[PDB]
RNA sequence: CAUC
């Protein structure tokens, strides 16, 4: 829950709506960050992102490492 | 709810 970085831009690698998670590659470090559907803010699939989309997000310390939070479009 |  501790915030590591804010207003990070990245590219969605993939997001699977069946399993409800995916990964975003950070543009600043080129590292993948885990993203769960509950971390995406509301837009059927009210909380989802599309493969290849640019998004903005915070990076927080989750249970099993770094994960995205507050995922929006850029701006 | 960690590379589908």
Q: List phi, psi (to 5°) of A20.
A: 80, 25
Tokens of residue A25, six digits: 């590659």
Neighbouring C-alpha atoms within 13 Å toward the C-beta of A67: 18
For domain A1-75, the question of CATH label 3.40.1440.60 is answered with no
Protein-to-nucleotide distance from the CA of A33 to the C1' of B2, whole angstroms = 9
Q: List phi, psi (to 5°) of A19.
A: -90, -20
Protein-to-nucleotide distance from the CA of A34 to the C1' of B3, whole angstroms = 9
Q: How was this structure determined?
A: X-ray
| Angstrom distance (rounded) from CA A67 to CA A65 | 7
Confirm if A32 and A11 have CB atoms less than 8 A apart: no
């Amino acid at each position: 829950k501790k915030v590591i970085a804010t207003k990070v831009l990245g590219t969605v690698k993939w997001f699977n709506v069946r399993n409800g998670y995916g990964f975003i590659n950070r543009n600043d470090t080129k590292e993948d960050v885990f993203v769960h559907q509950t971390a995406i803010k509301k837009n059927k699939y009210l909380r989802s992102v599309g493969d290849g989309e640019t998004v903005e997000f915070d990076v927080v310390e989750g249970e099993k490492g770094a994960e995205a939070a507050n995922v929006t479009g850029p701006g």
